[PDB]
Structures are given as C-alpha cells and as structure tokens.
C-alpha cells in the first residue's frame, strides 16, 4: 500500500518531467527529459508512452495518472529489471561502465545538487574493483544496499 | 640606396606577417574541418520508474 | 551552449539565404539557393521547409528562428570520436588527397605521420 511519504516521492518524480509546472506532462516535455538522459525517442514512441499512462484520453499525463502507474510499478517486486533500466540511463555510452562524468550528468539533469567530491564519494563507495567506474554488478549492490 | 634599403626592410616585414597570417588562416580552417567532421561522425514505463529509483538513491546517499 | 563565434558563423550562413539582405528568408530566396545547388523544389516543398522552422507563423524566417534551428543542431565527447592516419582518414571523407595530408599534418604535433588522441585533443580544444 501507499504512504503519504511515497506519494511525495512520486510527486518529486512527476515534477522533473513537468517542466513548465502546469500539472501535466506532454509528449514534448517527456521528450526533452529523455533527450537529456541520453535517449533519442521517436515522436511516436513518445505518444505511445503518453497513451499508456493517459487514463482519461486528454493526451497528457496528470499526477493521479502518473501516480497510478508508479504505484502499480512499485508492487512489481521481481524488478531487478528496473535496476537494469536505471543502469542504462546512467551508462549513456552503453559501454557497460558508469563514469564519474556520466553519473554527474544524470545527477544534474535530475536536478540533484552534488559536489564533485560527493560524486567522487558515490563512485568510490560503489566501486568494488578499483577502476574508478561503476559496472552493472557494482551498480546492483549500490542500488539495493 | 638608403631609402630603397629601408623600403626593402619594410616589405620583408610585411611579407613575413603575410606568411604567418596565411598559416593562421589555414590552421583555423583545418581545425574547423576536424570539428565539423567529428560533428558529422558522432551522428517505456520502466524509464519513468528508473528516474524515480535514481532519485530515491540520491536521497539515501544524502542521508547516509 | 552557443558562443559569440558560432553566432557569427550562423549569421554568415543566414546571409547566403537572405539574398536581398532584408533580414528575412522567403520561399523565393530559398528556391533560388536550392536551384543553385541543383535541386528543383516545388512551391509547396519550399513552404514546408519554411514551416518547420517558422516559430512566429509569419511565413518567413528571421535570424532568431534560423539561429534557433542551427543552435539545436550544432573531455568525454572527444574520446568517442578518437576511437573511430592518412590512410585511416581519407576513409570518412568531401575533400581531396593532398588536403587530407594537410589535415593530418596539422594534427601531427609529434611529427609521426598519423594522429594521437593526445594531439587530436589539442586539435579539438
Ligand atoms: Ca507541463
Ligand atoms: Ca490525462
Ligand atoms: Ca558508460
Ligand atoms: Ca568498478
Ligand atoms: Ca530576404
Ligand atoms: Ca517567422
Ligand atoms: Ca601523431
């Protein structure tokens, strides 16, 4: 079930996509966020994304709608699949390693303010093997720790 | 001739600057053809939730 | 983000299309340049080209619209490309043989005949 607390975290996630603050997410906006996360989606995969979440048919995502999707996704608890998607977002060059700069860029585009030292700290704590970078398995430990 | 010798010096200086300037103009063009050529070479619901997991991860960190 | 230098080049590029220099590119002026590039666009084709870029909906393209378009489309970013020599170079490329040697020669800081990331870096920054 759902805590006042999880709702508020889900609203943080909503805000990032709602660029203009008007309470809805458009295909435009989803695009700018996706583009800023490395991907380059087609005008149609974007409309398809909106359409799967858009319960009322008005062509944009509001917060109840987003909330329904996120809450439902949360009760999938066999989801090492979602950590994989999280990995892919960070690893922009698909090379199997998250660099410091990759982590920084993602980090900034989610509005998250870390210092260069903090990022260094994040990588350092996650890097089990000492190569200054985060691989898939290290990322898993990090995300589930 | 004194005056002539003087003129010859002035033109030697002009000529050398012409040569340097032409080298700089060529370098700028090549650098730019390296760049415009680099510029022409490097050319689902789970994603929403991914974004969330990362945010969640940042919060945990800041609280660790 | 844009620089004063890239702004200037795009202002030069604009000029090639603003023939009569009035600050706006029209379907006519646009058709002229295409013809000189050996293309035969139909009147409706020129409209669609303008329409994709015509932010204010007025029918023509001004410099700020033109710039919006150009800016949208033009140590990590480097090394990707570096992973992809006179022989190795002529491959990708518009340009001539001698001119490729120039392009190499300029990059060849150490003077070894081919280009090393270290100097390619110097060639990018
Ligand atoms: Ca919005
Ligand atoms: Ca809706
Ligand atoms: Ca990577
Ligand atoms: Ca590692
Ligand atoms: Ca004009
Ligand atoms: Ca216009
Ligand atoms: Ca070399």
Q: At what angle do helices C4-17 and C63-73 cross, to 10 degrees?
A: 120
CA distance C20 to chain B (A): 28
Q: A102 contacts in C (CB within 8 Å)? A: 76
Residues C82 and C51 occupy one common structural domain:
no
- Final residue of a structural domain among A64, A79, A94: A79
Residue C125: partners with Cβ closer than 8 Å, 6 or more residues away: C78
CA distance A136 to A123: 13
* Enclosing domain of residue C82: 75-125
Dihedral in degrees, nearest 10, Cα atoms A68, A37, A106, A32: -80
CA distance B30 to C79: 19
Q: Please report which residue ranges of B1-64 form alpha helices under DSSP H.
A: 2-39, 45-62
CB-CB contact of C83 with B38 (8 Å):
no
Report which bound ligand comes closest to the CA of C64: 6
CA distance A91 to chain C (A): 13
Residues C81 and C24 occupy one common structural domain:
no
Q: C103 contacts in B (CB within 8 Å)? A: 30, 33-34
CA distance B47 to A31: 12
Q: Please report which residue ranges of A18-135 form alpha helices under DSSP H.
A: 27-36, 43-53, 63-74, 80-90, 100-109, 116-126
Adjacent-strand bridge partners of A42: none
Tokens representing B8 are 């010859």
To which residue do tokens 């906006």 refer?
A29
Residues C70 and C28 occupy one common structural domain:
yes
CA distance A69 to A54: 10
Residues A71 and A84 occupy one common structural domain:
no
Residues C30 and C86 occupy one common structural domain:
no
Q: Give the resolution value in Å.
A: 2.5
Q: Is C110 annotated as a binding residue?
A: yes
CB-CB contact of A120 with A100 (8 Å):
yes
Residues C61 and C97 occupy one common structural domain:
no
Q: Count CB atoms within 10 A of the CB of residue C27.
A: 20
Residues C69 and C26 occupy one common structural domain:
yes
| A135 membership: H or E segment, kind and range | strand A134-135
Residues A69 and A137 occupy one common structural domain:
no
Residues 5-44 (B) with a CB less than 8 A from some CB of A? 44
- Final residue of a structural domain among A23, A44, A79: A79
Residues A18 and A62 occupy one common structural domain:
yes
CA distance C29 to C49: 12
CA distance C106 to C108: 6
- Judged by phi (left if over 0) then psi (alpha if -120 to 50, else beta), residue C18 lies in beta
CA distance B42 to C77: 9
Residues A50 and A92 occupy one common structural domain:
no
Residues in chain B: 64
CA distance A138 to B27: 45
Grouping H, G, I as helix, E, B as strand and the rest as coil, residue B4 is: helix
Report which bound ligand comes closest to the CA of A105: 3
CATH assignment of B1-64, among 3.90.190.20, 6.10.250.2180, 3.30.110.30, 3.60.15.10 = 6.10.250.2180
Please state the domain count of chain A. 2
CA distance C22 to C37: 22
CB-CB contact of A113 with A126 (8 Å):
no
**A99 with C80: Cβ contact below 8 A:** no
Grouping H, G, I as helix, E, B as strand and the rest as coil, residue C25 is: strand
Residue of B nearest to A40 (CA): B43
């Amino acid at each position: 079930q759902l805590t006042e607390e999880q709702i508020a975290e889900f609203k943080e996630a909503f805000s990032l996509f709602d660029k203009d603050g008007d309470g809805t997410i458009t295909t435009k906006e989803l695009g700018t966020v996706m583009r800023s996360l490395g991907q380059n989606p087609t005008e149609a995969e974007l409309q398809d994304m909106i359409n799967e979440v858009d319960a009322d048919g008005n062509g944009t995502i509001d917060f109840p709608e987003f909330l329904t999707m996120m809450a439902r996704k949360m009760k999938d608890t066999d989801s090492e699949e979602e950590i994989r998607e999280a990995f892919r977002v960070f690893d922009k060059d698909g090379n199997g390693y998250i660099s410091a700069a990759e982590l920084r860029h993602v980090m900034t585009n989610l509005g998250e303010k870390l210092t260069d030292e903090e990022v260094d700290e994040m990588i350092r704590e996650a890097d089990i093997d000492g190569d200054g970078q985060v691989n898939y398995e290290e990322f898993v430990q990090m995300m589930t720790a | 001739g004194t005056l002539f010798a003087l003129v010859r010096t002035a033109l030697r200086i002009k000529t050398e600057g012409n040569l340097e300037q032409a080298n700089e103009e060529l370098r700028a063009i090549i650098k730019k053809i390296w760049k415009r050529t680099s510029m022409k070479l490097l050319d689902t619901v789970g994603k929403f939730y991914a974004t969330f997991l990362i945010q969640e991860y940042f919060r945990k960190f800041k609280k660790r």
